[PDB]
Amino acid sequence: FSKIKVKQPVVELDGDEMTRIIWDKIKKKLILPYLDVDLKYYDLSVESRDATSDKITQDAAEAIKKYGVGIKCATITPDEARVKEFNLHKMWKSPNGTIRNILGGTVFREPIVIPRIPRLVPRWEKPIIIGRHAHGDQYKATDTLIPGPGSLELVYKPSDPTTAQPQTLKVYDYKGSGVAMAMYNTDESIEGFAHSSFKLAIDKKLNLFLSTKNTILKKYDGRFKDIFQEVYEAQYKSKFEQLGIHYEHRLIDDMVAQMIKSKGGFIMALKNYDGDVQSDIVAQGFGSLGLMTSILVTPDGKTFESEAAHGTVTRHYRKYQKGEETSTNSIASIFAWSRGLLKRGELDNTPALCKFANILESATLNTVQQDGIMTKDLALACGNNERSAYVTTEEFLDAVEKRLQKEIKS
Amino acid sequence: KIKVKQPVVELDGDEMTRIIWDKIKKKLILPYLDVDLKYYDLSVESRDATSDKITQDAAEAIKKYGVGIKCATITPDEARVKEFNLHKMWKSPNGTIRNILGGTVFREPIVIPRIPRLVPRWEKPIIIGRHAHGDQYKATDTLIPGPGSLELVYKPSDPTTAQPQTLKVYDYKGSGVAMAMYNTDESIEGFAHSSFKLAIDKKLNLFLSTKNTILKKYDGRFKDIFQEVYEAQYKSKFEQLGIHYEHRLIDDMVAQMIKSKGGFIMALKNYDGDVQSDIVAQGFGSLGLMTSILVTPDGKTFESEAAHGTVTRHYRKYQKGEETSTNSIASIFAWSRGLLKRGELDNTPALCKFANILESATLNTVQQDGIMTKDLALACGNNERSAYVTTEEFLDAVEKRLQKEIKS
Numbered sequence A: 001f002s003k004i005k006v007k008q009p010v011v012e013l014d015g016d017e018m019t020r021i022i023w024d025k026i027k028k029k030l031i032l033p034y035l036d037v038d039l040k041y042y043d044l045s046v047e048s049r050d051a052t053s054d055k056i057t058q059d060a061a062e063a064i065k066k067y068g069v070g071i072k073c074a075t076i077t078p079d080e081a082r083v084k085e086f087n088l089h090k091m092w093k094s095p096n097g098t099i100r101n102i103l104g105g106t107v108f109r110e111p112i113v114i115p116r117i118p119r120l121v122p123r124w125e126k127p128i129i130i131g132r133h134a135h136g137d138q139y140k141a142t143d144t145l146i147p148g149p150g151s152l153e154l155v156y157k158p159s160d161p162t163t164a165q166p167q168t169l170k171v172y173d174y175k176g177s178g179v180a181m182a183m184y185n186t187d188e189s190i191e192g193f194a195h196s197s198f199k200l201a202i203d204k205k206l207n208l209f210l211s212t213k214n215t216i217l218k219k220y221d222g223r224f225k226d227i228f229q230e231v232y233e234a235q236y237k238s239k240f241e242q243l244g245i246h247y248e249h250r251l252i253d254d255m256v257a258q259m260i261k262s263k264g265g266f267i268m269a270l271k272n273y274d275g276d277v278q279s280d281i282v283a284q285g286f287g288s289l290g291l292m293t294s295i296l297v298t299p300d301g302k303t304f305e306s307e308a309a310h311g312t313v314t315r316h317y318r319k320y321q322k323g324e325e326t327s328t329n330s331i332a333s334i335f336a337w338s339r340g341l342l343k344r345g346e347l348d349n350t351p352a353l354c355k356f357a358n359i360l361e362s363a364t365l366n367t368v369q370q371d372g373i374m375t376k377d378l379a380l381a382c383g384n385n386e387r388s389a390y391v392t393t394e395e396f397l398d399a400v401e402k403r404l405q406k407e408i409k410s
Numbered sequence B: 001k002i003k004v005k006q007p008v009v010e011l012d013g014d015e016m017t018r019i020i021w022d023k024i025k026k027k028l029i030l031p032y033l034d035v036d037l038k039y040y041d042l043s044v045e046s047r048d049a050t051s052d053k054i055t056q057d058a059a060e061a062i063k064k065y066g067v068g069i070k071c072a073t074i075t076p077d078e079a080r081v082k083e084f085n086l087h088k089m090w091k092s093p094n095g096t097i098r099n100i101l102g103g104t105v106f107r108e109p110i111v112i113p114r115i116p117r118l119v120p121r122w123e124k125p126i127i128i129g130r131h132a133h134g135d136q137y138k139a140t141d142t143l144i145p146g147p148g149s150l151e152l153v154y155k156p157s158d159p160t161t162a163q164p165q166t167l168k169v170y171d172y173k174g175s176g177v178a179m180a181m182y183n184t185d186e187s188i189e190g191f192a193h194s195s196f197k198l199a200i201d202k203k204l205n206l207f208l209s210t211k212n213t214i215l216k217k218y219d220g221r222f223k224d225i226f227q228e229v230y231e232a233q234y235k236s237k238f239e240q241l242g243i244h245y246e247h248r249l250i251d252d253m254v255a256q257m258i259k260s261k262g263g264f265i266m267a268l269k270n271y272d273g274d275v276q277s278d279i280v281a282q283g284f285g286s287l288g289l290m291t292s293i294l295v296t297p298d299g300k301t302f303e304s305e306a307a308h309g310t311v312t313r314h315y316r317k318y319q320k321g322e323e324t325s326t327n328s329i330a331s332i333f334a335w336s337r338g339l340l341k342r343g344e345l346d347n348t349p350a351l352c353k354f355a356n357i358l359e360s361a362t363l364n365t366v367q368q369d370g371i372m373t374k375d376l377a378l379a380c381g382n383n384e385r386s387a388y389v390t391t392e393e394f395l396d397a398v399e400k401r402l403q404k405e406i407k408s
Ligand SMILES: NC(=O)c1ccc[n+]([C@@H]2O[C@H](COP(=O)([O-])OP(=O)(O)OC[C@H]3O[C@@H](n4cnc5c(N)ncnc54)[C@H](OP(=O)(O)O)[C@@H]3O)[C@@H](O)[C@H]2O)c1
Pocket: A073, A074, A075, A076, A077, A078, A096, A288, A289, A290, A307, A308, A309, A310, A311, A312, A313, A314, A315, A316, A327, A328, A329, A330, A332, A375, A377
């Protein structure tokens, strides 16, 4: 059929295991037949990474920065058993972290809602998006064991004693053995977090809430609150008002409670640790990870990386490897493509592309909603594990493919 | 009447909960028990009138006789200081009591089958234990104006038995923020003992959650101490009861928690305990069915109270002569749970029986008689005025049912 010309190159990052499998199928059956796009391919499989000494990972990030918009497949984050499983030169760092830090920007997780599929928190009918500040609180902290009595201090010595002054803060006086830890964060990173959060809220046309425990951590957390407020008043307030959306700081205690009581439909910006823990809570609350997507947004709002929020689905890959039946959800991976192409269409002002992206999504979701064709993970939420309620990994892709063709005739 | 061997320490509170507290004592307690109630008025006024001294006297008394029954109290803050013209912004009475008694607070929701929960699958209590000693809650934080180094420095009292430590935390290339916190093996060990005794008492599985994958030393310490404490005194008891202890990464626990049907205990570090307690409570429904107990390491001192506040919004209406529908179930349980502990300690099976009948009468007023306050009716999808009853009407109903229940 007629192909849509994609003006700017799209960066594609291949992953491994199960997702690598459905990725190739999604491409040939759902993308390549309708678009004339130039894909800058970067293989991020563990095998490819271990070979290039993890260089392709960096090269891929650079590519995304250069062209704007990357579309990524889940990848394996090597650990102990992984190093032996593939005979790696060493436990490489998670490609997700390496790319995220190279591009700057923040990651926002968004669940896809399908009416027909109940949520564990049934009241949730609209997505609750979680943005996580992944810079350096507890994830870059220094912790140790205090052996016995003594004093603990936080000491800061400025590189320039003329403008700033030294700090020597008393933390605690141990009367026995125990534990200690110190962490940091910077104005620069927090500022990017704010910018990335406001731009996504504008794009999504959703209310934005920042959560901290500023009542306790008066300075530390207070810092996040002040920078968001400052960045807001100066560059986004007027834009939030035109759309009818609002920004607001809320105590993590209140936000968290108001969150599970709501019906959803808004964005929560959170600090490293809260974002980590709350993302797992929200995802599970909506249901299957097969419906959790994610988008990386930079402060300048010119660079994006699109990828499913779940992993390589290793357990399903073990079955696949033996020829055993699998029911893996391809929905999130498909949306990695549609959301990435959508951004591609927006930056190049190519409505044609944007239109196709919304059609791919519609075809995908109506397959479940209207036709009732779905994978096991989805059927489980309905209370139907009978091998007649769900369909196989490939059967689902076949269904959406057929549906796309139909909905594409206009 | 039923004779309560040891004295029960009673702390009175403020606003709406103070109102229901007096009606409860007089209608559901005093008529059936011959108990010596050591009374302590912990209202905002009483506290500000004694420079917060009754608070301490109260805790000391709980420490003396064992169990305490407390009414929700007002925690001073900028706003409250102007409202009552408080001399000083007195700190949380719960905190002060917690410090004197040591011990850990466990939040347990009351599940009434007829009343739906927001997380529909939760049909069994999910109890959260909070280590409220001090991580972020006793940390020192500061702003960092610009480029410079940041270090953690430890100097031992006896540089003969311990080595000093000077760890590079970070080199700022720009302005930012810094923070440091601590915890002690002592409190962690206390936190462990209380958790285990509560699991044994409730006969439920116990789970400890941390981020020991990132905070290898700090959180690995909680893990190791709990394990040590577990094997040192509770493993066999757990084995006899058929319950299990386990450490879980917070990421896994929380995901598992929301996917479960409830029925277990989660011991959490200070911060997670705080945030997760609010999630769990809201998942079950009204804060009106939320209870809590303070449990000391030795397992001989308890403080029972509603897990909710003074219900200020409802108090104003009460002030304007307007009708109210405040759920008193949680307050009544504060009495029942406390009295149950009193009996367990005094080996007074009679007191324990009363306690269980008071809880049966209360809950059945809702489950069978269909008499409930507004919060519960709303949870049932009933938004009609005729669907619920007033604060006093509900108490009147429990009172009547209690009399019938006691008959046999
Ligand atoms: N690159 C990334 O973005 C990323 C993110 C996270 C993890 N990972 C990596 O992925 C590998 C495996 O991680 P993991 O053990 O957490 O597996 P996972 O891919 O995170 O999935 C865990 C489980 O969730 C369910 N699930 C996830 N996606 C599904 C889908 N699309 N359809 C149906 N069910 C789905 C399955 O449960 P059932 O087995 O019960 O069906 C699956 O076993 C590891 O190397 C990990 O580091 C990569």
